Amino acid sequence: MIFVKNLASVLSQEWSSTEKYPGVRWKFLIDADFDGSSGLSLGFAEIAPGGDLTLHYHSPAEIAVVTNGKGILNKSGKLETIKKGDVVYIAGNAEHALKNNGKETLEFYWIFPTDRFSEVEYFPAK
Amino acid sequence: MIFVKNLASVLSQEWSSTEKYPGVRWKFLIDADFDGSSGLSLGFAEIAPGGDLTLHYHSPAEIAVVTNGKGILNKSGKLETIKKGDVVYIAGNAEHALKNNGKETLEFYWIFPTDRFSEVEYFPAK
Numbered sequence: 055m056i057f058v059k060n061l062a063s064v065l066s067q068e069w070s071s072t073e074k075y076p077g078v079r080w081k082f083l084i085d086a087d088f089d090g091s092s093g094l095s096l097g098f099a100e101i102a103p104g105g106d107l108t109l110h111y112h113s114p115a116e117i118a119v120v121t122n123g124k125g126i127l128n129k130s131g132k133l134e135t136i137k138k139g140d141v142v143y144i145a146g147n148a149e150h151a152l153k154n155n156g157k158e159t160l161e162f163y164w165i166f167p168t169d170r171f172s173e174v175e176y177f178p179a180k
Numbered sequence: 181m182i183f184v185k186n187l188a189s190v191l192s193q194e195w196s197s198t199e200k201y202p203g204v205r206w207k208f209l210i211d212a213d214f215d216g217s218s219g220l221s222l223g224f225a226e227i228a229p230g231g232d233l234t235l236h237y238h239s240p241a242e243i244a245v246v247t248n249g250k251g252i253l254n255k256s257g258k259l260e261t262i263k264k265g266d267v268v269y270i271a272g273n274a275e276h277a278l279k280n281n282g283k284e285t286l287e288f289y290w291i292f293p294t295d296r297f298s299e300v301e302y303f304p305a306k
């Protein structure tokens with residue numbers, strides 16, 4: 055089983071969002087609920103200017119691949135700047151946030167070692 | 181543990197390559213051999229024009245995100261065009277190849293649901 059996706063592929067999928075991540079939206083591109091894939095899952099997120107993926111963690115490791123714009127990554131309390139062309143490693147349980155303080159859309163893919171997004175349990179900062 | 185990487189973070193590291201797939205060269209940005217990361221591994225790879233990482237397979241599921249250029253994906257015999265902005269799912273042991281039929285350098289990231297690259301064994305097609 056092999057397949058290809060881009061944003062246009064999922065025009066029909068409405069965006070996901072939540073009060074807790076204001077200015078943030080996302081769609082699933084590789085996910086067991088959608089594609090019947092397994093082992094890895096991937097979504098595409100947008101953080102609007104002024105937007106904030108607020109400090110959180112979860113049990114699986116995560117990789118973010120930044121594709122547009124720039125932001126302040128919050129590495130469990132140490133701030134660092136990220137931008138298009140960066141990849142990021144977030145070990146499980148590690149608290150991370152990402153704010154878009156620029157004027158361009160901060161776009162990135164994420165990846166989890168799981169079949170589905172929905173099997174990933176989110177927790178607010180301690 | 182959280183960290184960032186881009187091409188510059190790994191200028192010190194050398195382009196590993198193999199005769200089995202010519203025009204192909206990669207480096208490891210997220211990998212236990214290097215970072216003491218776990219759960220996910222990521223590499224960045226380049227295929228020269230006329231370059232083709234020949235069809236093959238391996239236990240882990242795999243995600244490719246194409247960052248630049250254009251190519252032809254060998255979906256176990258079913259050939260699909262892919263381009264910058266495309267993500268690619270490939271199940272465990274699904275045979276896959278990828279040829280660069282463009283002039284630009286075909287660029288992409290790969291992700292494995294493994295700690296390191298150096299434990300994932302590549303088998304040739306049969």
Ligand SMILES: [Mn+2]
Binds near residue numbers: 111112150
């Ligand atoms: Mn996260």
Ligand SMILES: [Mn+2]
Binds near residue numbers: 236237238242276
């Ligand atoms: Mn492969």
